[PDB]
Design goal:
PDB class: membrane protein
Helix content of chain A: 55-70%
Distance between the termini of chain A: 49 Å
Chains A, B, C, D, E: Bestrophin homolog
Number of domains of chain A: 1
Bound molecules: calcium ion
Entry title: BEST1 calcium-bound open state
Oligomer: homopentamer
Radius of gyration of chain A: 29 Å
Keywords: ion channel, calcium activated chloride channel, eukaryotic membrane protein, anion channel, transport protein, ligand gated ion channel, membrane protein
Assembly: pentameric
Largest sheet of chain A: none
Shape of chain A: elongated
Order of helices and strands of chain A: HHHHHHHHHHHHHH
Number of helices of chain A: 14
Strand content of chain A: under 5%
């Protein structure tokens, strides 16, 4: 994503006036193809009408242009497009919050799994690596950036997210469905094995660890649900037919007619319709935002930084349960004692 | 459902332009009947007006067409239809999330119910089969696809979801209401019987299993509530009268009149109203999406894949508590040790 | 409620076309009075204008009709009415989900309260009867159907929901406020008395039972809040003044004037305004849905089936803690063993 | 609040027609001042125009009235006002549900704090009085009705909500901020002191009591947040400038011009603009509802009955933990035994 | 923020009429620059047109002004701007509720961590200082006011929020990412160290403290998510291009033309367009509210008072676990005893 929050804290004058001077993740980069196609088609029809057509053929084109200008308002562009964009934005922010963060499981495993020797160290690192793997295996199914980072499971083995013994156990488990739920069972079995060996003191701490595991499992299930149940295809087809049909009508209807014929409405000849191009800018770019945000896990400039987030979660998770287990600062008095 | 999420990750040019070349679950398959009925009625009235009516009768039809063109805008089509479609889409996504997933109960039963012999194996499989049966018995009441897969309870017995002794116990329980709550009591009684025999260690683990049982029971209750309390019938009647009355008016009002009579507005004769057919496309198809999604558990192309989900839940549930109980990979060091 | 979900699973052709042939809970049954009053007033003014008024008086009525037709669009009908109907529908579905279901408490009491003799049987039945009574005493305060089923507390005694000793204890408790919270204290005291006698094993199971009791108490409190804090009366007055003032203006403005006077707009005389009657149909019926759903606990055709739900909850609750305590089917192998 | 829910259960004919015959909490009581000011200003300008101005001055007033009638539609009244009213209603119902109800803490304290002697009786009453005081001290900060009931802390002492020793301890605690969090710490300390003396059996019951304490603390924190973070003042200024500027324009633009001058639009002279007064009624009263509901804790007719609710909570809380501790009815058989 | 809730409790007459006489946090302070730029540009173009241009050049400017007045309505200002402002307000109130409040952790630590000597006092103060530091370290990353209060970590050391030993431990932990999660691991490790020394009695109280820690960690994670995932930049660019392009068109289109030329629409010459300036006021100020509230953690007049809240949380947290540990008032009888 493009983050500009620190630039818009106060509202002086050019709070939004400077942000339109940015190229990375802009409206200009999105509309740079469709806008130039629209410019090319409009100026092509304009030059053909001004330089090629005969007089009766121009007189027929005038009636066609008046018909298309009168009756292009029957197409419900804003009515369909606002509803579709509201769906896309609602599902967008709903899909951000479904991304699993390891930090609650991190806080519980960093303190409740005892042992300062190598066995408890290995145990805590294996628990957090299972919690991260149960996230990576669903993020490589819902995202294309993670899938291009990890094309096969051997790339998950080489990155250190999975040992080859876990790869052999993962391949030996026979299931035709998506196997993202495999480490979230290994986590619970390893937590119970840790409790039975005395590394976890009581049942309440074990049940807290398992509750946070099931919370992360619900997060991964929400990601699977938002990826599998898309926006219905019939909505996408209706909105693209709406925008493309409206501006296909505006290719003919918004053409500058002859001022010497003295039509009502077409009195000035400017050869560049500023308001038609602005209306195409707002409607077509308003559709392009929904095209960008309908899948926020791809490789757009404003899709989610999933690979960075995987690297952060792996580093922070393996940091807080290895170096920070019983490594506390010295309990000292504050500036407010007596 | 038709899933196209992997095709719309990035937004290059034809992100939505290729998706209108798809037939399965499209606007075209929905409107293929109503659109051709509208085309047939319009061209029938057009040919009758052009070839059959006498001159005074055509002059009366002209006044009828001008009246219907002037006063068809009084019908609040968009105002009623947007509100109705917003209800349908909100209830649609609310009904997806109410579908019970066994995975939290799966994670707890796979680890907390002890025993590697045949008795604990039978116990875990019976617990997960009760948790799946308490979902199947409500999905065959809210869906028509599951009801056509399982027409009677004997088909539930033959699929392995229920043993015949459980069928006899299920028939001996006398209740005139829906019996989907029967396995969700058997689960709690079998969990307490498992705790009393020592298969579950403490009370906290038992209460966690019962809390996830009650969570799945709340999911099934939400499905029962959304199926039983429909959208009010008066809304459905008002929206279908709105769309059908508006286009019944547009059968007469949008007719191309005679250009030689020189009416204001009807100057060009094209014999095919492109914008009337587009307006019928958007409004009527916008109603057809609500017709499709008012019950997302039927057998439309974009209703929910409930039978696939039942098969997945049964296979994954009986997999993770039988093969994956204490079958863990070897605890080995990572690529980040020292 | 009228349930039609099983009829609209697929979307073939007449998915909504058959549902307008139904009378029970329709738009026709709602508007059958107001629509005929509007028809009567319009045709009365029409016949008086056509047969009674003199020429200068008709000429004054023409100017009054043109004024009322020009200036009835200043009344914000859709703007106020859409906001009001959105409130009514949001509160409608929010009030359905606040109805207490005994099933979570049923699942916990059916398994955690021990004893196969008559004392534990009496104990479980008394606990579930308290949980049902704490729901009946708020449903007879928020609904008129339950209040007509149970006019006094003696009718609650005769139905078996309350023994006469509990009636005497309920009357001896002195409080000027609504006493729906009385059985939800008796439940907690009886659960603690059951724990102290050894019928409940540990504290965790008791706390789970009390947590589900407090969940049902929050459900009853939400019902009390939605009944006591209505939609503000000023909104109801503004919407009824809006609809009635707009169609009081349309009684005069939509009248067919004389075509021989040649007014702009009034050229055709049909004597039955189809689009005025349709506009009255949609706006007035859109108000009548809000009139129906502003209190969904009354005795409309599409209000909630509260009495049926009370009977179901009583039967299922006293069934699952009496016959189904330790009555489990035989643990047998599945079709997938080895 | 004005409650009319029992009057609108069914929808016969006059379901909303009788509710406009009510004065308490009506649109008429709100608009009785602003409407008469608008009537006075309009009729003043009308009589001055009809009786005082000369002919050229009337001819200038005609052009001013046509300008103001043509260009008053540029003011976005409905666009700003609908958004503002939606915020006010959303925050209104969000602030009702944040009002703390003592009933969950009541159910736990009435059963889990042991002792039938005077010490446990005093202990339970002191716990519930702390839970009520932690609500009263935030309701006298967010409401003006509670602040006029309790102007100082001595009025809280005289009402029995606080003993004078608790008043001295409350004054000895030095903090420049709002002290509504003081009894919600006393509750937890007294619950731990009750557990350490054996009045509470185990830790799980104590943690349940503390969890419901923190739930009530979150309710009080939501009330503090909704009172402290208002709707932004810039929205309130924009909506009042919108409504007042639009009807300041309509004082001149809606004036009946001279019919003998024969302007397009002003042909009939009625001297009382019915639709202008109706439009002022709906827009200005639609603003007055937001003025009423922007602070629903004041002393309007449809603000919340906070003092009644404080009296109810105090009476019910001190009732259910004193008289109803181990005072249960006799366990007797039902009408459905065998 | 500017709080005016106590001024708008009742609705008499001038409930909103007095609030437009306030300068701090008003629409006037926001629009004081852009409005004067618009006034300057409009009056500059007006004086140039009235005093400088020749007759044919004025005749060309008339056609340009009629074109820009006819075709500036094609720009979807309200359609884009309402959607954007709805996003800004929804995210605004969603970001207020994500601010962590220490009070639940305060209530649990003030009672469950035993010890009246200096060691338990130091232990409770260190726990609450960790809970406050885990909030300060994310509020100095999401806000500019806290970042200007604490430019470096030495300023956090000097304020008493962090001892220098904790500063050395905080710098020794090597991580390239944001370190706001560091004290929320120290809290859990210190709570487990407090439990193992006997300062916390059982496991249930420890798990309650850790659950409230993870709740505060989820609050800080929501703040990090709302700061990192902004509103998409393409929406901000489209709305600022919409407002600026519409009023750039209105600089030419709303100009008062010559009345002697007798154009339809431009008949009166007033030299100050009141309704154009009002329309600029509402649209441009409606954009400026979104500019103010897109980052509510900056230093605007109506952004959140974050520094005051940090000071309050520090004072109240270190107050309630030091002075109020076992300092209870005397248990005395109420006014309602017998
Ligand atoms: Ca994307
Ligand atoms: Ca369907
Ligand atoms: Ca009703
Ligand atoms: Ca108020
Ligand atoms: Ca700001």
């Amino acid at each position: 994503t493009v983050t500009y929050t620190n630039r818009v804290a106060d509202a002086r004058l050019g709070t939004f006036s400077q942000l339109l001077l940015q190229w990375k993740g802009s409206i200009y980069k999105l509309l740079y193809s469709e806008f130039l196609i629209f410019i090319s088609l409009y100026f092509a029809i304009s030059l053909v009408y001004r330089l090629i057509l005969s007089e009766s053929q121009r007189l027929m084109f005038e009636k066609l242009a008046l018909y298309c200008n009168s009756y292009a308002e029957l197409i419900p562009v804003s009515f369909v497009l606002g509803f579709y964009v509201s769906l896309v934005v609602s599902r967008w922010w709903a899909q951000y919050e479904s991304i699993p963060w390891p930090d609650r499981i991190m806080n519980l495993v960093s303190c409740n799994v005892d042992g300062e020797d190598e066995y408890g160290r290995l145990l805590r690192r294996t628990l957090m690596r299972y919690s991260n793997l149960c996230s990576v295996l669903i993020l490589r199914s819902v995202s294309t950036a993670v899938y291009k980072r990890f094309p096969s499971m051997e790339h998950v083995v080489r990155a250190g997210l999975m040992t080859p013994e876990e790869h052999k156990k993962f391949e030996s488990l026979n299931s035709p469905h998506n196997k993202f739920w495999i480490p979230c069972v290994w986590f619970s079995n390893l937590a119970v094995k840790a409790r039975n060996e005395g590394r976890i003191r009581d049942s309440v701490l074990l049940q807290g660890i398992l509750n946070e595991l099931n919370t992360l499992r619900s997060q991964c299930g929400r990601l699977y649900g938002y990826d599998w149940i898309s926006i219905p295809l019939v909505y996408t087809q209706v909105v693209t037919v709406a925008v493309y049909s409206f501006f296909l009508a505006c290719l003919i209807g918004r053409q500058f007619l002859d001022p010497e014929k003295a039509y009502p409405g077409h009195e000035l000849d400017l050869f560049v319709p500023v308001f038609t191009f602005l209306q195409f800018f707002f409607y077509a770019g308003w559709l392009k935002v929904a095209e960008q945000l309908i899948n926020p896990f791809g490789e757009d400039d404003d899709d989610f930084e999933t690979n960075w987030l995987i690297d952060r979660n792996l580093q922070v998770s393996l940091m807080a349960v290895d170096e920070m287990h019983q490594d506390l600062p010295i309990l000292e008095k504050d500036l407010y004692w007596n």
